[PDB]
RNA sequence: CAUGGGAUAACAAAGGAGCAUUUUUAAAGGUUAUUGGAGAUUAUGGAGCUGUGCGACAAAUGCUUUCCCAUCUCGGUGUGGUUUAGU
């Protein structure tokens, strides 16, 4: 049984990036998945993606520029205070110069740099670099 | 298929994206409601009623015409089955097996199927009790 | 059993409560007559409370039905008078 | 079984009577529409009920189970040797 | 005036020029037209709103009617809009049912009690269905461009191309004016196989 | 000059409130029924139940009709058992955080709570309990409000 | 312990026929202030309680319904589709 839609989606994108595919189909879709995709798209790690409505959990077709080395979900969503950003950057990011940790804050889903600038904590969703 | 077995069948029906009933379907909503209500009064379960309308009257989906599901229509008229339809069929399944196992005590395969059917009943009945489609203190009896 | 039969004949208890108490008396639940009488009084008080609640709910339901019917007939009068 | 579904429907919506004596009473009147007899029924009682059904032109069904099975198929916790449905209740 | 019965009682006092013209047309159609005669007596409208479509000819007459007349309108909508359009030269007539939207609650317990037909998503898709009624949506996409925009494209059956293509631009603009949401339209000749038409 | 109330008096000693004299009628300690009944408004914005004001029950441990005062902790729990007399067991379920594994455990605590006859809680109901003086070996709280 | 945020979640409830319009008016009926305090008594009205009407609004689903008996080429639009209506 599928337990995490976000983890399934990020696993599918990472596999497609490893194989060098140009597009990947994501199924099922979710608000959290689309929010995560928009964060990656904001920083330029993915191109345009299209949400396909089927009167159920929809599908997403993501165009992939080859800039995404790896994306993945962190399960469970561990709580992260504003003082814990450096710990998570150390543990999961390849470097302090690039890569993002995605958080679920009360201000929305955002990368760790944006969340730090807003002085807000939350739960860690995943990462990409 | 999946629960209590190794089957991985995918056979099912795929409802269409376009929910609007076709322009050639001239049956009114009220006449459909009379059809399902009279078909239930004829003694058909909600699934049998839908297949009857689908195969003969050209009504693909009762919900897409009347706005209401077949069981919902029966509930409004009070015609809903006392025991839910599927729980009825599983209980009938277990009863028929038990009648068979009275005469064939060496039929260990049917005994194995019987455990699954009953262990399925005790989760379906737990669901209907938690959802209050069944009375509390409702117990399946062997 | 004699006390239970007397109570059933006197209509202090109904046949269902009589059956329950008969099986409990066979089951060594009551030590003497006073214990059984106390149990009967407790059951009767519980029934009275529940029946009072049921009567209150029934009255509320009947009032709701009256209000719905009155609103419907007012709607009919409004529609008839709008016809002008 | 078709008769089991029909009996369940009659229990749900129709009118019926259980027992041999009440079945005979409904047969003497013009009320019975169908008579169901268990295969357990004593032969003389079954012959008497069948004779009543023949005189009254009433359809007669021989149930494949015994009186316990007929009682269970009626949704009852007792045994019935003869069933008489007075109103089919839209069944058939 | 007898034609003022085709308006809500509040509007009958000082009707607008557009509202009175629509009311008069409805009153005439309730007896002149064969099909409309069986439905219009039980019908009246709320208000008539004029919309100017930029870079286009004609205007759009948005007609609001109570949602309780939804099935009544859907019965004769194609006839009704065609009749109103020939009554008003240089105009397009759109029948939109007035629907109420409950603002999304901030409480999980209030959210479970929201009538799903009063949500903005349900209302907005119902308004879109109102403005294209003889045709139905056969597909819906959301194109999320790299700049952060999310544009919704709605696909119609290519059969209705010769019947609705002229009014698609007006539908898109009126949809934005009513819902403050953008919509683009496309055509699929094979909606089952998700095959888009090039022209 | 009233008749002895049979329903209340079954304890081999006359049951009465110790704050008022029920024999002599005064204004404020007289309820709607006209009987002299003591009742107080506990603090913390808790309304006195209508059964406390107008009822006939005698309870020396009721927070609204006796000398039991509410001070200290105000807690919330779910009714677990009502088998005792005028006393209920409530259960407080909570998550305990284990620091090493960065995860939670489900834990519960059971409290014996005095329930006034003004309330009739059933198993599964959520109640608000206030801390009082020790009323028995295990009772330290009183039921203040019942939410079905 | 107080307060701000509400994205992700948790707890609880429900299982959807197991359910629920407002505002004018008048008329009919059935242990409060104020009378200078205080102690009775009375009656008069408020205000609610029903029912009789009355005016103005709405209404998320058509009672100008439904069911049961009985009698019997013209406009608009686009560069050809559209409600009619003659064939
Ligand atoms: Mg399993």
What is the distance between the alpha carbons of residues E46 and E9, in angstroms, rounded to a whole number? 9
Nearest to B41 among D5, D6, D13 (CB): D13
A25 touches chain E (CB under 8 A): no
CB E136 within 8 A of CB E157: yes
Mark residues 37-76 of chain A whose C-beta is closer than 7 A to nucleic acid strand G.
Answer: none
What is the distance between the alpha carbons of residues E166 and D48, in angstroms, rounded to a whole number? 83
**Nearest-Cα residue of chain B relative to residue D69:** B99
Strands E184-190, E150-157: pairing is parallel
Nucleic strand G within 7 A of Cβ B11: no
Which of B39, B40, B43, B91 should we substitute to test contact with D (largest number of D Cβ atoms within 10 Å)?
Answer: B43
* Rounded CA–C1' distance between A61 and G28, in angstroms: 75
Helix or strand holding residue B115 (H, E): helix B108-130
Strands D60-62, D34-37: pairing is parallel
What is the distance between the alpha carbons of residues B108 and B114, in angstroms, rounded to a whole number? 10
Non-local (6+) Cβ contacts of E125 within 8 A are: E137
DSSP readout, F108-128?
EEEEEEE--TT----TT-EEE
Torsion of CA A11, A14, A16, A18, to 10 degrees: -140
Touching F: which chains, 3+ CB pairs < 8 A?
none
CB B60 within 8 A of CB B13: no
Q: Which residues pair with D15 in a beta bridge?
A: D87
What is the distance between the alpha carbons of residues A120 and A101, in angstroms, rounded to a whole number? 14
Distance (Å) from the alpha carbon of E139 to chain A's nearest alpha carbon: 7
Helix or strand holding residue D85 (H, E): strand D82-87
Note every long-range contact of B13-18, with CB atoms under 8 Å and residues 24 or more positions apart, other chains counting: B15/A55, B15/B61, B16/B60, B17/A54, B17/A55, B17/E138, B17/E139, B17/E191, B18/E136, B18/E137, B18/E138, B18/E191
Q: B53: number of CA atoms within 13 Å, CB side?
A: 27
DSSP readout, F35-57?
-B------STTPPPPHHHHH---
DSSP state of F91: E
Closest among F74, F70, F76 to F48, alpha carbons compared: F70
CB F92 within 8 A of CB F120: no
Measured CA to CA in angstroms, residue B6 lies from A1, B1, B9, B122 at distances of: 14, 7, 9, 20
CB B77 within 8 A of CB B38: no
Q: Compute the distance from residue B117 Cα to the ligand 1 centre, in Å.
A: 13
Maximum CA pair distance of chain F? 71
Chain breaks in chain D (C to N over 2.5 A) after: none
Q: Given phi > 0 = left and psi -120 to 50 = alpha, else beta, which region is D41?
A: beta
Helix or strand holding residue D25 (H, E): helix D20-28
* Rounded CA–C1' distance between E72 and G53, in angstroms: 34
DSSP state of E96: E
Distance (Å) from the alpha carbon of E167 to chain A's nearest alpha carbon: 24
In total, chain E counts a number of residues equal to 199
What is the distance between the alpha carbons of residues F44 and F48, in angstroms, rounded to a whole number? 11
Method: cryo-EM
What is the distance between the alpha carbons of residues F109 and F16, in angstroms, rounded to a whole number? 35
CB E48 within 8 A of CB E26: no
Positions of chain G reached by protein Cβ under 7 A = 4-18, 20-22, 31, 51, 54-67, 75-78, 80-85
Residue found by looking up tokens 């760790």 in the block: A112
Mark residues 7-26 of chain E whose C-beta is closer than 7 A to nucleic acid strand G.
Answer: 8-13
What is the distance between the alpha carbons of residues E32 and E15, in angstroms, rounded to a whole number? 23
| A51 contacts in chain E (CB < 8 Å) | 141-142, 144
Measured CA to CA in angstroms, residue A76 lies from A6, E95, E181 at distances of: 12, 50, 36
Residue E75: which nucleotide is closest by CA–C1'?
A: G62
DSSP readout, D2-23?
HHHHHHHHHHHTSEEEESHHHH
What is the distance between the alpha carbons of residues A51 and F21, in angstroms, rounded to a whole number? 77
Measured CA to CA in angstroms, residue D40 lies from B95, D4, D44, D84 at distances of: 20, 17, 12, 16
Report the side by side order of strands in the sheet with E137-144: A23-26, A59-63, A49-52, E137-144, E150-157, E184-190, E195-196
| E136 contacts in chain B (CB < 8 Å) | 18, 20
Residue A107: which nucleotide is closest by CA–C1'?
A: G7
| B17 contacts in chain E (CB < 8 Å) | 138-139, 191
Q: Which two tokens stand for residue B122?
A: 């005790």
DSSP readout, chain A?
----HHHHHHHHHHHHHHHT-SEEEE-S--HHHHHHHHHHHHTTSS--EEEE--SSS-EEEEE--TT---EEE-SS--EE-GGGHHHHHHHH-S-SSS-EEEEEETTEEEEHHHHHHTT--EEEEEEE-
CB D27 within 8 A of CB D56: yes
Non-local (6+) Cβ contacts of A105 within 8 A are: A115, A118, A120, A121, A122
Nucleic strand G within 7 A of Cβ B38: no
Residue found by looking up tokens 């008003």 in the block: E88
| Cis check: omega of the bond before A28, within 30 degrees of 0 | yes
Closest among D27, D29, D35 to D6, alpha carbons compared: D35
Options 3.30.1490.100, 3.20.20.80, 3.30.1370.30, 3.10.350.10; CATH for A1-68 is 3.30.1370.30
* Rounded CA–C1' distance between E37 and G72, in angstroms: 23
Classify burial at D54, counting beta carbons within 10 Å of its beta carbon; exposed 0-12, middle 13-18, buried 19 or more: exposed
* Rounded CA–C1' distance between E42 and G65, in angstroms: 9
Measured CA to CA in angstroms, residue E78 lies from D92, E74, E123, E187, E198 at distances of: 46, 8, 21, 20, 27
Mark residues 54-83 of chain E whose C-beta is closer than 7 A to nucleic acid strand G.
Answer: 57-58, 66-72, 75, 78-79, 82-83
B24 touches chain A (CB under 8 A): no
What is the distance between the alpha carbons of residues B12 and D28, in angstroms, rounded to a whole number? 53
Q: Which two tokens stand for residue C16?
A: 């269902």
Q: What distance lies between CA B80 and its chain's CA centroid? A: 11
What is the distance between the alpha carbons of residues F16 and F22, in angstroms, rounded to a whole number? 8
Non-local (6+) Cβ contacts of D34 within 8 A are: D58, D59, D60, D61, D84, D85, D88
Q: Which residues pair with A111 in a beta bridge?
A: A102
Q: Which residues pair with E153 in a beta bridge?
A: E141, E184
What does residue B44 show for φ and ψ, rounded to 5 degrees?
-105, 140
Q: Is the dihedral of CA E10, E12, E17, E23 positive or negative?
A: positive
CB C43 within 8 A of CB C4: no
- DSSP3 helix / strand / coil % (chain B, rounded to 5): 55, 0, 45
Non-local (6+) Cβ contacts of A46 within 8 A are: A13, A37, A40, A62, A63, A64, A65, A67, A68
Which of D4, D9, D14 should we substitute to test contact with B (largest number of B Cβ atoms within 10 Å)?
Answer: D9
| A1 contacts in chain B (CB < 8 Å) | none
In chain E, DSSP assigns E strands to 47-52, 59-66, 91-98, 137-144, 150-157, 184-190, 195-196
What is the distance between the alpha carbons of residues B60 and B51, in angstroms, rounded to a whole number? 9
| D12 contacts in chain B (CB < 8 Å) | 43, 82
Measured CA to CA in angstroms, residue A19 lies from A65, A128, B30, B56 at distances of: 12, 17, 57, 51
What is the distance between the alpha carbons of residues E44 and E11, in angstroms, rounded to a whole number? 11
Nucleic strand G within 7 A of Cβ E33: yes
Measured CA to CA in angstroms, residue A6 lies from A26, A85, C31, E40 at distances of: 10, 21, 66, 52
Non-local (6+) Cβ contacts of B117 within 8 A are: B90, B93, B94, B97
What is the distance between the alpha carbons of residues D8 and B88, in angstroms, rounded to a whole number? 12
Give the A window 58-97 contacts with B, CB below 8 Å: none
Touching A: which chains, 3+ CB pairs < 8 A?
B, E
Q: Which two tokens stand for residue D55?
A: 């005189």
Closest among A8, A18, A5, A10 to A72, alpha carbons compared: A10
Torsion of CA F99, F102, F108, F113, to 10 degrees: 60
Measured CA to CA in angstroms, residue E187 lies from C3, E153, E195 at distances of: 86, 10, 9
Helix or strand holding residue D53 (H, E): helix D43-56
* Rounded CA–C1' distance between F49 and G32, in angstroms: 25
Closest among A127, A21, A15, A11 to A64, alpha carbons compared: A21
What is the distance between the alpha carbons of residues B18 and B52, in angstroms, rounded to a whole number? 22
CB A80 within 8 A of CB A88: yes
Q: Compute the distance from residue B4 Cα to the ligand 1 centre, in Å.
A: 7
CB E28 within 8 A of CB E67: no
Which of E124, E143, E144 should we substitute to test contact with A (largest number of A Cβ atoms within 10 Å)?
Answer: E144
Given an 8 Å threshold on Cβ–Cβ distance, is E146 in contact with A47? yes
What is the distance between the alpha carbons of residues B59 and B31, in angstroms, rounded to a whole number? 12
Nearest to A41 among E140, E143, E146 (CB): E146
Non-local (6+) Cβ contacts of C29 within 8 A are: C39
Residue F124: which nucleotide is closest by CA–C1'?
A: G12
| B15 contacts in chain A (CB < 8 Å) | 55
Nucleic strand G within 7 A of Cβ B48: no
Residue found by looking up tokens 């790690």 in the block: A45
Classify burial at A124, counting beta carbons within 10 Å of its beta carbon; exposed 0-12, middle 13-18, buried 19 or more: buried
CB E117 within 8 A of CB E174: no
Nucleic strand G within 7 A of Cβ C83: yes
CB C34 within 8 A of CB C4: no
Q: What distance lies between CA E21 and its chain's CA centroid? A: 19
Strands F139-147, F103-114: pairing is parallel
CATH architecture of A69-129: 2-Layer Sandwich (3.30)
**Nearest-Cα residue of chain B relative to residue A53:** B17
Helix or strand holding residue C81 (H, E): helix C33-82
What is the distance between the alpha carbons of residues B17 and B26, in angstroms, rounded to a whole number? 21
Helix or strand holding residue E19 (H, E): helix E17-32
Q: Where are the domains of chain A?
A: 1-68, 69-129
CB F137 within 8 A of CB F122: no
Q: Is the dihedral of CA B118, B120, B123, B126 positive or negative?
A: negative
A44 touches chain E (CB under 8 A): yes
3-state secondary structure (DSSP) of residue B13: coil
Report the side by side order of strands in the sheet with E59-66: E47-52, E59-66, E91-98
Q: Which two tokens stand for residue F6?
A: 């049979």
| B43 contacts in chain D (CB < 8 Å) | 5-6, 8-9, 12, 90-91
């Amino acid at each position: 049984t599928m337990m995490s839609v976000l983890a399934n989606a990020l696993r599918t994108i990472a596999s497609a990036e490893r194989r060098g595919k140009r597009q990947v189909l994501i199924r099922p879709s979710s608000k959290v998945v689309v929010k995560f995709l928009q964060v990656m798209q904001k920083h330029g790690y993915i191109g345009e993606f299209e949400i396909i409505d089927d009167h159920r959990a929809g599908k997403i077709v993501v165009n992939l520029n080859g800039r995404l080395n790896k994306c993945g979900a962190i399960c469970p969503r561990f709580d992260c205070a504003t003082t814990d950003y450096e710990k998570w950057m150390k543990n999961i990011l390849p470097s302090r110069q690039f890569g993002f940790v995605v958080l679920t804050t009360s201000l929305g889903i955002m990368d760790h740099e944006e969340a730090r600038s807003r002085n807000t904590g939350g739960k860690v969703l995943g990462f990409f670099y | 298929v999946r629960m209590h077995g190794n089957g991985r069948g995918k056979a099912s029906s795929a409802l269409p994206y376009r929910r609007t009933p076709p322009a050639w379907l001239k049956i009114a909503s009220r006449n459909v409601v009379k059809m399902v209500c009279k078909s239930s009064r004829k003694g058909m379960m909600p699934s049998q009623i839908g297949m009857e309308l689908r195969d003969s009257m050209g009504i693909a989906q009762v919900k897409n015409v009347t706005g209401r599901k077949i069981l919902r229509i029966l509930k409004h008229n009070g015609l809903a089955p006392e025991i839910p339809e599927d729980l009825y069929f599983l209980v009938k399944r277990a009863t028929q097996m038990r009648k068979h196992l009275e005469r064939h005590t060496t039929d260990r395969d049917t005994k194995y199927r019987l455990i699954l059917v009953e262990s399925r009943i005790h989760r379906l009945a737990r669901y209907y009790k938690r959802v209050k489609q069944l009375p509390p203190t409702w117990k399946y009896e062997s | 059993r004699r006390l239970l039969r007397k109570y059933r004949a006197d209509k202090k208890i109904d046949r269902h409560v009589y059956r329950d108490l008969y099986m409990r008396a066979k089951g060594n639940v009551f030590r003497n007559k006073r214990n059984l009488v106390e149990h009967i009084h407790k059951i009767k008080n519980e029934k009275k409370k529940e029946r009072q609640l049921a009567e209150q709910l029934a009255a509320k339901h009947l009032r709701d039905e009256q209000n719905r019917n009155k609103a419907r007939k007012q709607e009919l009068k409004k529609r008839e008078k709008e016809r002008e | 079984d078709t008769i089991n579904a029909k009996l369940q429907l009659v229990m749900k919506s129709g009118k019926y009577v259980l027992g041999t004596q009440q079945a005979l009473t409904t047969l003497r009147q013009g009320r019975s529409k169908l008579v169901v007899i268990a295969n357990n029924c004593p032969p003389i009682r079954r012959a008497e009920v069948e004779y009543y059904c023949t005189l009254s032109k009433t359809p007669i069904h021989h149930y494949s189970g015994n009186n316990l099975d007929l009682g269970t198929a009626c949704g009852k916790h007792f045994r019935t040797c003869v069933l008489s449905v007075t109103n089919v209740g839209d069944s058939d | 005036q007898p034609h003022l019965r085709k308006l809500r009682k509040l509007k009958r006092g000082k009707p607008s020029d557009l509202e009175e013209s629509v009311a008069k047309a409805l009153f005439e159609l309730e007896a002149s037209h064969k099909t409309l005669r069986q439905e219009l007596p039980r019908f009246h409208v709320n208000t008539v709103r004029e919309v100017k479509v930029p870079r286009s000819k004609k205007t759009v007459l948005v007609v609001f009617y109570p949602l309780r007349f939804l099935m009544l309108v859907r019965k004769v909508q194609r006839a009704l809009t065609s009749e109103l359009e020939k009554r008003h030269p240089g105009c397009l007539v759109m029948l939109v049912a007035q629907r109420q939207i409950t603002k999304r609650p901030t409480d999980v317990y209030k959210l479970q009690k929201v009538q799903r037909s009063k949500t903005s998503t349900a209302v907005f898709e119902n308004i879109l269905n109102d403005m294209i009624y003889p045709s139905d949506v056969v597909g819906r996409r959301w194109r999320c461009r790299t700049d952060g925009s999310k544009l919704m494209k709605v696909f119609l059956d290519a059969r209705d191309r010769k019947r609705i293509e002229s009014r698609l631009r007006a539908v898109a603009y009126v949809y934005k004016q009513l819902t403050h949401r953008r919509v683009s339209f496309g055509f699929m000749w094979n909606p089952k196989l998700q095959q888009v038409s090039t022209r | 000059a009233h008749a002895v109330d049979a329903t209340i008096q079954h304890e081999k000693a006359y049951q009465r409130q110790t704050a008022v004299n029920e024999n002599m009628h005064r204004r404020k300690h007289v309820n709607k029924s006209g009987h002299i009944r003591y009742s107080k408004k506990i603090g913390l914005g808790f309304k006195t139940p209508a059964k406390a004001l107008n009822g006939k029950y005698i309870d020396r441990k009721c927070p609204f009709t006796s000398n039991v005062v509410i001070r200290g902790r105000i807690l919330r729990g779910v009714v677990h058992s009502t088998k005792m007399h005028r006393t209920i067991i409530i259960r407080r379920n909570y998550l305990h955080f284990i620091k090493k594994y960065q995860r939670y455990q489900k834990r519960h605590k059971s409290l014996a709570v005095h329930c006034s006859p003004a309330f009739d809680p059933k198993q599964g109901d959520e109640v608000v309990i206030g801390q009082c003086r020790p009323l028995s070996k295990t009772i330290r709280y009183n039921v203040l409000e019942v939410v079905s």
